[PDB]
Design an enzyme around this catalytic site. Structure first.
Site, PDB file in Angstrom:
ATOM      1  N   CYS A 417      -0.943   2.840  -8.323  1.00  0.00           N
ATOM      2  CA  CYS A 417       0.059   2.620  -7.297  1.00  0.00           C
ATOM      3  C   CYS A 417       0.229   3.956  -6.561  1.00  0.00           C
ATOM      4  O   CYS A 417      -0.557   4.276  -5.661  1.00  0.00           O
ATOM      5  CB  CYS A 417       1.394   2.060  -7.864  1.00  0.00           C
ATOM      6  N   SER A 418       1.224   4.745  -6.948  1.00  0.00           N
ATOM      7  CA  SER A 418       1.525   5.943  -6.179  1.00  0.00           C
ATOM      8  C   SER A 418       1.592   7.125  -7.124  1.00  0.00           C
ATOM      9  O   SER A 418       0.800   8.045  -7.009  1.00  0.00           O
ATOM     10  CB  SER A 418       2.812   5.788  -5.340  1.00  0.00           C
TER      11      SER A 418
END
Length: 484
Positions: A417-418
């Protein structure tokens, strides 16, 4: 120690406590009631207390006027060492020095309360093995407690007295809390006049269930989830593993968030050797952050080296105005070189909940080394919280599972994701839990908190919020219920 986290305290209460029992440099952390999900770091300095917001919106903890972190524990460790880094009015520096301990035992695995003597002996009978134990409130002598232990063959009960907020077993040391009392006898076991030794090995497991009864367990937890999530959170101090490699000057710019680093012991080593990523073994997985512009070559080298053929992206490139991940793949029909790595985008197909990209990956100069890498890109995750229906994530996951299954000798599944800990953790855990079920059918034992806790020991703070915690339960129940 998570002693400095106070699950049931008010902001005013926090201020009294630090002001009377604490001193300058004392601190504690607590859930923030100024809008839940948040947490507050309450610290004393100059004979006054400031409260500092920490937000968790799913990806990490964001200390206001401070860094971003994977757990509160990692946050606290960082500021208790690196002094001068925790600033106040964008100028004044606050010092975390003295963790102000919590004597509130609700977040211990071994603590129940409410529970009868008999319902205790039944669970210690059904679920317990040698060393299993719990503490409960005394009903017969209210205000007191009882420690029950199995010697697996025998259940022994020891009265625990509360005498002006101190705890004892009827002689010896008077402790500040039941945690201290517990921890003292886990290492200094009691002996019965008869010769049996009360080892306090593991708390009684009250979370493992038969999968066929997840409908049941969920409705129970639905009036529950919070105490259970918090119980898990209290275990994160056991998980402070070394993260030296990501902390090297040379590697600092390879991390999207400075303090969210991979454990040394499970990190992916590139044959520089560094990427912010970990192998997660329960089908294995790699959990990694969203690429930086300067780690895109590393990312593909990793995918190549590990023979991964599936990649799962759980973020849009930009969410809420913030960059989460850079586009690290070609336009459809285009080809690119990322250092020595070459990737062709052969085809894209959109579904409602996600896009699929068929990519060809190879080392430049070596066409024999080409292989198809499948990238699933989840596009429908909401601004706030988690999806209402888990059907989307589910069909996404089942589709991912099948791609993985249909390719011989495929490597780990790359999930990101991040920061690579929130949705990334959530997806992996859900997938691990359903794997067990597809194998062993519906007549099997699953255990959400323990499964997260196993994954947390391989990358920092996997599964970030109670909202993600609840979602896992919903997701598994859903899969169960549609298996009929």
């Amino acid at each position: 120690s998570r002693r400095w986290f106070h699950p049931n305290i008010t902001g005013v209460e926090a201020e009294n406590l630090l002001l009377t029992r604490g001193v300058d440099g004392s601190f504690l952390a607590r859930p923030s009631k100024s809008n839940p999900g948040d947490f507050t770091l309450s610290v004393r300095r100059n004979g006054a207390v400031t409260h500092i917001k920490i937000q968790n919106t799913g990806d990490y903890y964001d200390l206001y006027g401070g860094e971003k972190f994977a757990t509160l524990a990692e946050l606290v460790q960082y500021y208790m060492e690196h002094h001068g880094q925790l600033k106040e009015k964008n100028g004044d520096v606050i010092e975390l020095k003295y963790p102000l301990n919590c004597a509130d035992p609700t977040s211990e695995r071994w603590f129940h309360g409410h529970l009868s003597g008999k319902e205790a002996e039944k669970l210690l009978t059904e679920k317990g093995k040698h060393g299993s134990f719990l503490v409960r409130e005394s009903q017969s002598h209210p205000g007191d407690f009882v420690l029950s232990v199995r010697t697996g063959s025998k259940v022994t009960h020891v009265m625990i007295r509360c005498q002006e907020l101190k705890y004892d077993v009827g002689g010896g040391e008077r402790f500040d809390s039941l945690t201290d009392l517990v921890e003292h006898y886990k290492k200094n076991p009691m002996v019965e006049t008869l010769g049996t030794v009360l080892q306090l090995k593991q708390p009684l497991n009250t979370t493992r269930i038969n999968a066929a009864e997840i409908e049941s367990r969920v409705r129970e937890l639905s009036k529950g989830f919070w105490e259970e999530f918090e119980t898990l959170q209290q275990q994160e101090c056991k998980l402070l593993y070394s993260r030296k490699e990501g902390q090297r000057q040379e590697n600092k710019n390879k991390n999207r968030y400075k303090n969210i680093l991979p454990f040394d012991h499970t990190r992916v080593v590139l044959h520089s050797d560094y990427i912010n990523a970990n192998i997660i073994m329960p089908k294995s997985y790699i959990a990694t952050q969203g690429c930086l512009q300067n780690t895109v070559n590393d990312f593909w080298r990793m995918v190549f080296q590990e023979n991964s053929r599936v990649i799962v992206m759980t973020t849009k490139e930009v969410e809420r105005g913030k960059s989460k991940c850079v586009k690290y793949w070609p336009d459809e029909y285009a080809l690119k070189e990322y250092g020595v790595m070459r990737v062709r985008n052969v085809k894209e197909s959109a579904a409602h909940d996600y896009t699929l990209r068929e990519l060809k990956l190879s080392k430049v100069g070596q066409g024999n080394t080409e292989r198809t890498v499948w990238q699933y890109h989840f596009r429908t995750w909401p601004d706030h919280g988690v999806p209402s229906d888990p059907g989307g994530v589910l069909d996404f996951l089942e589709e991912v599972h099948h791609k993985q299954e249909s390719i011989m000798d495929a490597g780990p599944v790359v999930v990101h994701c991040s920061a690579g800990i929130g949705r990334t953790g959530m997806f992996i855990v859900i997938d691990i839990l359903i794997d067990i079920i597809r194998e062993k059918g519906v007549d099997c034992d699953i255990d959400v908190p323990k499964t997260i806790q196993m994954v947390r020991s391989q990358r920092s703070g996997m599964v970030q919020t109670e909202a993600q915690y609840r979602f896992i339960y919903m997701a598994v129940q859903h899969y169960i219920e549609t298996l009929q």
